[PDB]
Structures are given as structure tokens and as C-alpha cells.
Design a protein around this ligand. Structure first.
Ligand code: QR6
Length: 167
């Protein structure tokens, strides 16, 4: 049993809810919140901008030190950093950004990072300002992630379309 509340069950291991991932993280304080990161960990907008703002820019400060030491992530890759006031840990995962021409096949590799964590609160990778089709992202999620994932979808219209179109 866990504290995630009000989710629709899509599969054995994937759950979904119309929710602001920032508000959901503050309320549950999950072991892992996933950030929709880029390779430079520049958390300017979208989910990343929102999570970073909620940490009062502490996420960005930590991220800048990470990059200065380690260099950029790979598209499809991830790193574990602090969850600050939102979670124990933040898993920064880089999905391909279609508005940069990145290969959408890398979306499966991106979701594979979730399998290293038993339970996660997460957004749909490559959705929103990353330009991919969220219906496709949900399908890849369900077909790739085997651990327990609680997806937060900010837009109510999109959430309903995601639920109503789910096979
Ligand atoms: O600002 C926030 N939260 C907060 C949450 C999410 C997002 C976000 O980018 N959402 C994206 C979105 C929007 C439209 C269509 C989409 O396919 C997607 C994918 C992604 C998602 O829904 O995961 C943002 Cl900007 C802010 N909280 C402060 C108190 C105000």
C-alpha cells in the first residue's frame, strides 16, 4: 500500500491522474519524482521549470554543480539528484525533444531508467514542450516500465483523451 490517491489504474503497474506534478510531489513526498530534464539540466520551462521554481532554484544550483563535474547527460539517459522539498530523490530523465529533431526511438531508452526505481511519480516523457505525441508516450511507458509508476498529467483535456484513447 502507498499514499498515492485518486489515480486511475491503467495496467498492473501504471496509474494516471489529472494533477499538477508539483502539487502532487508536495503532498505525497515520494521517494522518487521524475523531472523532464534536458542534457544540460537547464530547468527553464515545462515540468522542469515548474519543479525547479518549487525548489526556489535549489534544483538548478545542484544541477549546475552536477554538470560542471560530470558534463551533459545523454538523450535517453538520467541521473539521480536530490528531491529537495518535493521528494527524497529527483530522477532527471532526458526524453528526446522533437523540437530539436531528436530520435523518438530514444523514448523507450528514456523510460527504461524508471525500472531502476520501485515506485515513481512522473510526467509523460517527451510530452508538452518536448513535442512528442502524449498518447505515444503513454503507450511506450506502459510497454517499457515494469516498476510502479504514478503519472501526473497537468492538462485535464489531455488526461481525458489519454484515458479515453487508452488500449
Ligand atoms: O507550474 C506548476 N506545475 C506544472 C506542471 C506541469 C507543467 C508542464 O509542463 N506540463 C506539461 C504539459 C502541458 C500540456 C500538454 C502536455 O502534453 C504536457 C506535458 C507536461 C505534463 O503535463 O506532464 C508545467 Cl509547465 C507546470 N505548478 C505551479 C503551482 C503553479
Amino acid at each position: 500500500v502507498n499514499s498515492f490517491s485518486g489515480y486511475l489504474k491503467l495496467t498492473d503497474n501504471v496509474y494516471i491522474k489529472n494533477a499538477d506534478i508539483v502539487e502532487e510531489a508536495k503532498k505525497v513526498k515520494p521517494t522518487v519524482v521524475v523531472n523532464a530534464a534536458n542534457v544540460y539540466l537547464k530547468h527553464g520551462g515545462g515540468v522542469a521549470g515548474a519543479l525547479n521554481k518549487a525548489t526556489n532554484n535549489a534544483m538548478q544550483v545542484e544541477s549546475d554543480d552536477y554538470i560542471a563535474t560530470n558534463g551533459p547527460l545523454k538523450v535517453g539517459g538520467s541521473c539521480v539528484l536530490s528531491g529537495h522539498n518535493l521528494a527524497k530523490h529527483c530522477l532527471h530523465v532526458v526524453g528526446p525533444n522533437v523540437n530539436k529533431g531528436e530520435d523518438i526511438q530514444l523514448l523507450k531508452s528514456a523510460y527504461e531508467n524508471f525500472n531502476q526505481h520501485e515506485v515513481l511519480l512522473a510526467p509523460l516523457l517527451s510530452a508538452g514542450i518536448f513535442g512528442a505525441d502524449p498518447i505515444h508516450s503513454l503507450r511506450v511507458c506502459v510497454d517499457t516500465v515494469r516498476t510502479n509508476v504514478y503519472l501526473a498529467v497537468f492538462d485535464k483535456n489531455l488526461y481525458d483523451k489519454l484515458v479515453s484513447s487508452f488500449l
